[PDB]
């Protein structure tokens, strides 16, 4: 009985795949982190009004096409 | 022959790493889900025109700097 | 001693989990790729000014509420 050699290569095989996965997992984390740090902006309200961007918020455009 | 004890701790080791990976995988999924639900907006056309945001779309600013 | 059968099912078990993980990892990659390709836009400056979008950049709205 040497089924200990087949079991060994089988564990070695799984271990390699786990190493590859740990790598893709690390890559994924760095990509998600960058996406999170990009500071993207959410959608403007969907209320039939036009919006412009100011101080991290959507402000009504008509607000500036009037004095006040 | 006790190489069954070394094989056991080796499987235990891989299993722990797989547990850690399952965790980072779950964390990644929750982060990607939130990024997907944030409702970010795509780029405006790159055609030399100015755009404002309205009803989930980029509309030409000049459209409002005119009556119609 | 058949602890070789228990070790076998244990490796089989870990291998299945590793297969599931490889799948969730692949799914995550396709989702992150799409998020990266969506071409979202970063925040406008936070300087108290109103901005509109033009040619892949935030341009001051007042720039168009004046001839030049």
Q: How many CB atoms lie within 10 A of CB A41?
A: 20
Determine the 3-state secondary structure of C31 from DSSP.
helix
d(CA A10, CA C10): 11
Q: Please give the structure tokens belonging to residue A51.
A: 């919006």
Q: Please give the structure tokens belonging to residue A9.
A: 């290569």
Instruction: Tell me which method was used to determine the 3D structure.
Output: X-ray
Provide, for chain C, the percentages of residues in helix, strand and coil under a 3-state DSSP scheme, each rounded to the nearest 5. 55, 15, 30
Q: Given CB atoms, is A53 within the 8 Å cutoff of chain C? A: yes
Q: Given CB atoms, is B8 within the 8 Å cutoff of chain C? A: yes
Q: Please give the structure tokens belonging to residue C34.
A: 């799409």
Measure in Å the smallest separation between the Cα of C21 and chain A Cα atoms: 8
φ/ψ (deg, to 5) at A67? -65, -50
Q: Residues B5, B8, B10, B13: is their CA dihedral positive or negative?
A: negative
Contacts of C44 in chain A (CB under 8 A): 41, 53-54, 56
Determine the 3-state secondary structure of B60 from DSSP.
strand
Contacts of A54 in chain C (CB under 8 A): 44, 48-51
State how far Cα A4 lies from the chain centre: 43
Q: How many CB atoms lie within 10 A of CB C15?
A: 18
d(CA C54, CA B60): 10
d(CA B36, CA B28): 12
Of B26, B40, B51, nearest in space to C34 by CA: B40
State how far Cα A60 lies from the chain centre: 30
Contacts of B56 in chain A (CB under 8 A): 43-44, 46
Measure in Å the smallest separation between the Cα of C55 and chain A Cα atoms: 15
Measure in Å the smallest separation between the Cα of C52 and chain A Cα atoms: 6
Comparing CB atoms, the residue among B7, B14, B36 nearest residue C14 is B14
Resolution limit, Å: 1.9
Mark out the alpha helices in chain B (DSSP H runs). 3-37
Task: Count each helix (H run) and each strand (E run) in chain C, helices first.
Answer: 1, 2
d(CA C65, CA A52): 13
Q: Looking at chain A, which residue has its C-alpha nearest residue B65?
A: A65
Residue corresponding to tokens 């990607």: B32
Fold of A1-68: 1.20.5
């Amino acid at each position: 009985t040497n089924k200990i050699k087949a079991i060994e290569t089988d564990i070695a095989s799984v271990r390699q795949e786990v190493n590859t996965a740990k790598g893709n997992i690390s890559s994924l984390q760095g990509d998600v982190q960058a996406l999170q740090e990009a500071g993207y902006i959410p959608e403007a309200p969907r209320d039939g009004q036009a919006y412009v961007r100011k101080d991290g918020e959507w402000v009504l455009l008509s607000t500036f096409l009037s004095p006040a």
